[PDB]
């Protein structure tokens with residue numbers, strides 16, 4: 001039942017796509033990759049079409065291609081980007097050299113909702129609720145985002161939010177957890193919870209919480225708010241050199257957040273305290289945060305679903321370039337679209 005394709009020049013390359021997709025036009029000025037908006041003649045809705053770059057040039061390109069298709073095929077949740085379609089003009093494995101991914105077309109990213117102005121407390125509740133609902137789902141599959149920031153979060157006009165990643169699945173360091181920038185090495189899923197705390201502060205105040213000029217300055221701004229490590233945290237660091245280094249960027253106590261977020265909802269301030277903890281073993285989880293009193297008007301414990309298990313064992317394998325290309329071809333052929 002193979003569709004009829006048509007060719008055109010877009011982004012100075014030949015795009016070849018099913019006649020299903022009409023009125024292609026480049027969007028994002030390069031910020032999303034090679035992406036066009038299009039009209040889906042099957043549904044009457046607009047979609048985003050991404051063309052992958054040199055997908056089987058090398059073992060590293062081939063494994064990156066496979067990884068992104070496996071992640072997108074897994075994600076089935078309202079608050080996470082999903083795969084509407086995946087296609088290739090190739091009629092066989094022999095001629096397989098191009099991959100196209102189709103998602104929802106979003107309206108605006110969170111920088112374009114905030115625009116350096118405060119949001120209302122009710123609007124902040126609704127946005128952060130949806131990010132946490134998405135993160136409960138991703139974390140339940142043992143997937144960590146690792147680069148959450150306003151540019152990777154997007155809404156429609158009804159303010160319905162989805163999580164995406166415009167980088168390489170694993171630019172600015174303003175949203176990065178302190179353990180990552182201190183090279184502490186034993187990361188857990190609450191690196192994403194740190195990023196959510198920074199984003200929530202920014203929605204409430206209209207300003208960046210930790211706008212560091214450089215790597216050193218980023219850590220000094222963090223430690224001025226959250227303080228020098230306590231005795232319980234220092235006991236979990238191996239190297240004398242690492243313990244000296246963190247203490248040399250601090251020598252200062254944790255501030256009370258009630259003194260920093262003047263005018264804010266006291267439940268907002270309590271939740272920010274539980275997200276922005278230096279010791280990642282003591283940081284609140286996505287599931288715990290959804291039950292916090294700050295989200296009473298939105299929380300439904302019966303509609304905060306978890307993921308099917310995600311087999312990540314390919315990440316440990318060393319395969320030949322034609323093997324990664326064949327595994328990718330099989331995943332295109334096996335795709336089942338979501339319901340109309």
Ligand SMILES: Cc1ccccc1-n1cc(C(=O)NCc2ncc(C(=O)N[C@@H](CCC3CCCCC3)C(N)=O)s2)cn1
Pocket residue numbers: 027032035048049050067068071072080081101102103104105106107108109138144145154163164165166167168169
């Ligand atoms: C028009 C607009 C306006 C304002 C903001 C955003 C948008 N906008 C851009 C797209 C888009 O590029 N869609 C095509 C895509 N293919 C692939 C995508 C993607 O997110 N891969 C991830 C997938 C895996 C992650 C895993 C963590 C959770 C999020 C998905 C990756 N880098 O491998 S997104 C849709 N809407």
